[PDB]
Amino acid sequence: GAMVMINKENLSSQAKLWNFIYGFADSLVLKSAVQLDLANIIHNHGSPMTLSELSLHLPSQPVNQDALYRVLRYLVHMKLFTKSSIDGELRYGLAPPAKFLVKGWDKCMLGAILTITDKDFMAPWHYLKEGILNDGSTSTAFEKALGTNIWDYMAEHPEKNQLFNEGMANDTRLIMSALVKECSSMFDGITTIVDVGGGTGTAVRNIAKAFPHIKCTVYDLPHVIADSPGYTEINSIQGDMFKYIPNADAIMMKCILHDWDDKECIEILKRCKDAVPRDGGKVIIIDIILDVKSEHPYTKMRLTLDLDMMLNTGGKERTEEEWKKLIHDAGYKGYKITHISAVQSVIEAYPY
Numbered sequence: 001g002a003m004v005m006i007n008k009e010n011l012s013s014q015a016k017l018w019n020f021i022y023g024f025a026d027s028l029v030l031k032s033a034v035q036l037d038l039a040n041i042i043h044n045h046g047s048p049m050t051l052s053e054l055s056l057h058l059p060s061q062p063v064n065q066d067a068l069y070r071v072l073r074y075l076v077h078m079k080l081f082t083k084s085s086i087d088g089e090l091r092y093g094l095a096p097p098a099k100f101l102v103k104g105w106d107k108c109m110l111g112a113i114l115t116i117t118d119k120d121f122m123a124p125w126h127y128l129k130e131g132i133l134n135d136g137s138t139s140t141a142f143e144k145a146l147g148t149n150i151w152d153y154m155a156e157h158p159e160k161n162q163l164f165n166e167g168m169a170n171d172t173r174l175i176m177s178a179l180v181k182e183c184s185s186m187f188d189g190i191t192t193i194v195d196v197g198g199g200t201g202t203a204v205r206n207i208a209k210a211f212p213h214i215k216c217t218v219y220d221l222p223h224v225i226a227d228s229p230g231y232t233e234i235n236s237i238q239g240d241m242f243k244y245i246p247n248a249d250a251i252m253m254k255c256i257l258h259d260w261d262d263k264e265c266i267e268i269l270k271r272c273k274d275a276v277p278r279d280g281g282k283v284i285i286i287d288i289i290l291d292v293k294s295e296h297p298y299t300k301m302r303l304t305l306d307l308d309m310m311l312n313t314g315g316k317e318r319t320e321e322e323w324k325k326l327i328h329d330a331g332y333k334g335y336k337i338t339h340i341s342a343v344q345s346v347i348e349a350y351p352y
């Protein structure tokens with residue numbers, strides 16, 4: 001026979017399923033709160049605001065106040081926003097994690113939120129079954145959903161190119177302080193550095209400002225360098241890192257190697273090794289290290305990014321043992337990991 005239930009089933013376990021089913025509601029309610037700029041209206045106001053007060057400052061008019069109330073009720077329940085009775089009125093304030101929704105500091109996450117929750121950029125996730133049950137197709141889910149591989153897609157869609165680049169610029173802003181303060185000695189002795197796949201230059205503009213002695217270069221594909229500002233003192237070069245890595249004292253790669261399969265990473269890493277001097281040259285990798293055995297605050301999002309790479313780029317997020325095999329296979333002498341209390345860690349890879 002089958003299981004026969006004879007008493008009340010657990011509500012909490014059913015609610016766990018419902019909450020996972022509706023996970024996307026947290027994503028897309030958060031998207032709307034960002035688009036409405038609620039956190040910044042309140043933060044600029046400097047104290048909790050009534051529904052009416054909030055409405056007057058919203059990005060467009062008119063405002064459906066019943067809808068706004070109901071979205072605020074949901075955001076209160078997420079514990080991003082607060083609601084309380086003050087002097088005879090209901091007033092909406094910010095909870096502590098809403099600080100990341102507030103503009104004007106390095107940990108504001110708004111760019112990354114608008115990129116990741118974009119409708120077209122979410123589409124590949126609908127093709128996850130197809131990533132396992134391939135039917136012999138070797139295309140990424142991104143190509144199944146949007147027509148071609150991610151990099152050529154950005155080349156062909158300027159508005160999406162800009163959205164993607166600004167999400168990565170934001171992710172870079174989140175780490176740059178910890179990188180230039182905690183890892184300052186990594187930049188000792190260096191006179192030149194190339195950020196390979198450096199995006200629209202957030203990382204190099206920050207390194208250049210912190211280390212005015214170092215001649216910095218950003219290097220990426222033409223359509224990304226075309227979405228970047230021009231500065232006289234930083235070199236901007238375009239090209240294909242699979243064919244050319246510029247000789248420099250140090251090469252850096254942030255959120256690059258997680259886009260590629262093992263063979264491709266080894267090829268990239270070998271070319272980076274050949275580009276730096278035997279005397280003090282180093283390759284600085286910034287990417288996730290997946291823990292195998294313990295849970296950390298960013299564990300859940302690092303596993304999420306593992307699937308994101310699987311679907312969107314064809315890459316993966318790697319454990320330390322996997323990083324070790326790759327760096328070994330590329331012919332380096334060894335590596336050193338530095339944690340910077342971020343999603344990614346720093347891995348210095350040292351040639352002979």
Ligand SMILES: Nc1ncnc2c1ncn2[C@@H]1O[C@H](CSCC[C@H](N)C(=O)O)[C@@H](O)[C@H]1O
Nearest residue numbers: 168172197198199220221224240241254255
């Ligand atoms: N063949 C190639 N050569 C150079 N850059 C490449 C490339 N293929 C992809 N890229 C670049 O790799 C970057 C991956 S996203 C990471 C960007 C930046 N380093 C950051 O962390 O914010 C993109 O900017 C993409 O345009």
Ligand SMILES: C[n+]1cc2c3c(ccc2c2ccc4cc5c(cc4c21)OCO5)OCO3
Nearest residue numbers: 112115116121122124164167168171308312
């Ligand atoms: C995870 N992702 C997937 C994307 C993606 C796209 C386009 C952009 C992105 C993206 C852009 C910025 C990001 C920034 C991030 C991040 C993830 C992303 C991110 O996690 C850490 O900070 O096409 C479908 O898939």
Ligand SMILES: [K+]
Nearest residue numbers: 024119122123
């Ligand atoms: K969707």
Ligand SMILES: [K+]
Nearest residue numbers: 290291299302
């Ligand atoms: K982890």
Ligand code: NA
Nearest residue numbers: 011014015018
């Ligand atoms: Na139920």
